[PDB]
Scaffold this active site. Structure first.
Site, PDB file in Angstrom:
ATOM      1  N   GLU A 119      33.889  31.941  39.854  1.00  7.30           N
ATOM      2  CA  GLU A 119      34.892  32.127  40.587  1.00  7.30           C
ATOM      3  C   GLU A 119      34.628  31.348  42.212  1.00  7.30           C
ATOM      4  O   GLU A 119      34.983  32.044  43.280  1.00  7.30           O
ATOM      5  CB  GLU A 119      35.302  33.474  40.903  1.00  7.30           C
ATOM      6  CG  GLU A 119      35.581  34.315  39.866  1.00  7.30           C
ATOM      7  CD  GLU A 119      35.691  35.928  39.703  1.00  7.30           C
ATOM      8  OE1 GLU A 119      35.647  36.443  40.848  1.00  7.30           O
ATOM      9  OE2 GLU A 119      35.707  36.647  38.647  1.00  7.30           O
ATOM     10  N   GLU A 129      36.991  34.962  29.520  1.00  8.34           N
ATOM     11  CA  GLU A 129      37.014  36.811  29.448  1.00  8.34           C
ATOM     12  C   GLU A 129      38.311  37.085  29.228  1.00  8.34           C
ATOM     13  O   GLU A 129      38.996  37.801  29.999  1.00  8.34           O
ATOM     14  CB  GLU A 129      36.661  36.829  31.103  1.00  8.34           C
ATOM     15  CG  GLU A 129      35.383  36.347  31.371  1.00  8.34           C
ATOM     16  CD  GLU A 129      34.825  36.919  32.824  1.00  8.34           C
ATOM     17  OE1 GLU A 129      35.673  37.534  33.388  1.00  8.34           O
ATOM     18  OE2 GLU A 129      33.771  36.045  33.309  1.00  8.34           O
TER      19      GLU A 129
HETATM   20  O1  LIG Z   1      31.751  39.721  35.568  1.00  5.15           O
HETATM   21  C1  LIG Z   1      33.134  39.544  35.402  1.00  5.15           C
HETATM   22  C2  LIG Z   1      33.775  38.497  36.115  1.00  5.15           C
HETATM   23  O2  LIG Z   1      33.272  37.174  36.014  1.00  5.15           O
HETATM   24  C3  LIG Z   1      35.493  38.487  36.219  1.00  5.15           C
HETATM   25  O3  LIG Z   1      35.894  39.013  37.475  1.00  5.15           O
HETATM   26  O4  LIG Z   1      35.969  39.732  35.401  1.00  5.15           O
HETATM   27  C4  LIG Z   1      35.314  40.876  35.841  1.00  5.15           C
HETATM   28  C5  LIG Z   1      33.709  40.830  35.682  1.00  5.15           C
HETATM   29  O5  LIG Z   1      33.195  42.146  34.773  1.00  5.15           O
END
Ligand SMILES: O[C@@H]1[C@@H](O)[C@H](O)OC[C@H]1O
Ligand SMILES: O[C@@H]1[C@@H](O)[C@H](O)OC[C@H]1O
Ligand SMILES: O[C@@H]1[C@@H](O)[C@H](O)OC[C@H]1O
Ligand SMILES: [Ca+2]
Length: 305
Positions: A117, A233
């Site tokens: 991020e 993710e």
């Molecule tokens: O660690 C993860 C992060 O990388 C992303 O922002 O989504 C939430 C978190 O659990």
């Protein structure tokens, strides 16, 4: 019962932790620790390392021959609290020691997520778990991303044989964000510091007001660097079973069938995953599979690439 991607050309992995543990290896063939590899999880108290949760994910991955993604060396949440007030030189020595510690303990990391991020959550805040150590890594510096360069330099030094990845969210949803991210990648590549590009692709990033084609075009832009892409993710909300299913059919294939995407990791599958309120889970509390999961098994079996 074998993982969905058992015969595929790329992995289909999941975040791992206690609530995602049941049946994990019957579904997924790659893992990321959900929380235990964040720095504030390991070193909540200065100079005493609690490796228990990270060790649990790494030992499980090794037992099951699945690639392990270390999550995450530098981020702006879930960082230790004691580092916030130290002078930058001291903060830096702590960062270096954290890198070296992880490298020593975990020799078989498949993908090291060095910074997560950078466009959204740099370590520049002094709130709970903020870290407040941006200046220990040079701040923005000349290029605007000096601290990202410094983080990847440390990772190259400490992990000389490990694939290094950058990760972020809300990238493929717009050309402007993809061009921003690629400026960081451009700066890293001046020193050949990065090996892989991650994009998270949570539900909030793939909503239909932006066409899937725009995500595909931005994947092509990211792929133009010659670097492998990972979807890191992934989740799709499930207020009804049918909305979740329709979203899976619309969104998932675009990432899965992209020739530059070398793996996808879901951000959990059982209740208690991050987007629990939004019912992003693919298995209900009673253990039953939802229609999106039924579909996903068949779709992945039919798309080995
Ligand atoms: O660690 C993860 C992060 O990388 C992303 O922002 O989504 C939430 C978190 O659990
Ligand atoms: O509250 C924190 C949560 O938001 C994350 O997982 C760890 C918790 O301490
Ligand atoms: O468990 C959560 C993880 O999924 C993200 O980061 C915040 C954590 O609370
Ligand atoms: Ca330390």
């Amino acid at each position: 019962a074998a993982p969905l991607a058992a015969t595929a050309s790329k992995f289909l992995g999941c975040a791992y932790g206690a609530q995602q543990a049941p049946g994990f290896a019957q579904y997924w063939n790659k893992l990321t620790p959900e929380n235990g590899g964040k720095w504030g999880s390991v070193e909540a108290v200065r100079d005493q390392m609690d490796w228990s949760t990270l060790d649990a994910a790494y030992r499980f991955a090794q037992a099951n021959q699945m690639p392990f993604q270390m999550h995450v060396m530098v981020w702006g949440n879930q960082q230790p609290e004691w580092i916030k007030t130290l002078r930058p030189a001291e903060q830096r020595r702590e960062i270096e020691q954290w890198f070296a510690a992880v490298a020593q303990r975990y020799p078989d990391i498949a993908l090291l997520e060095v910074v997560n991020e950078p466009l959204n959550d740099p370590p520049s805040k002094a709130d709970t778990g903020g870290g407040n150590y941006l200046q220990a890594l040079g701040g923005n510096g000349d290029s605007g991303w000096e601290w990202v360069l410094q983080s990847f330099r440390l990772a190259r030094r400490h992990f000389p044989h490990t694939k290094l990845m950058i990760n972020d969210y809300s990238i493929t949803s717009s050309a402007q964000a993809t061009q921003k991210y690629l400026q960081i990648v451009r700066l890293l590549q001046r020193e050949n510091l990065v090996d892989a590009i991650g994009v998270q692709e949570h539900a909030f990033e793939t909503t239909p007001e932006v066409a899937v084609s725009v995500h595909r075009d931005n994947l092509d832009a990211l792929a133009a660097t010659g670097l492998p892409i990972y979807i890191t993710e992934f989740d799709l909300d499930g207020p009804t079973d049918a909305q979740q299913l329709a979203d899976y059919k619309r969104v998932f294939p675009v990432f899965w069938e992209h020739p530059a995407v070398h793996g996808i990791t879901l951000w959990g599958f059982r209740p208690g995953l991050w987007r629990d309120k939004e019912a992003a889970y693919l298995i209900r509390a009673d253990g039953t599979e939802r229609p999106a999961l039924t579909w996903l098994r068949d779709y992945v079996a039919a798309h080995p690439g």
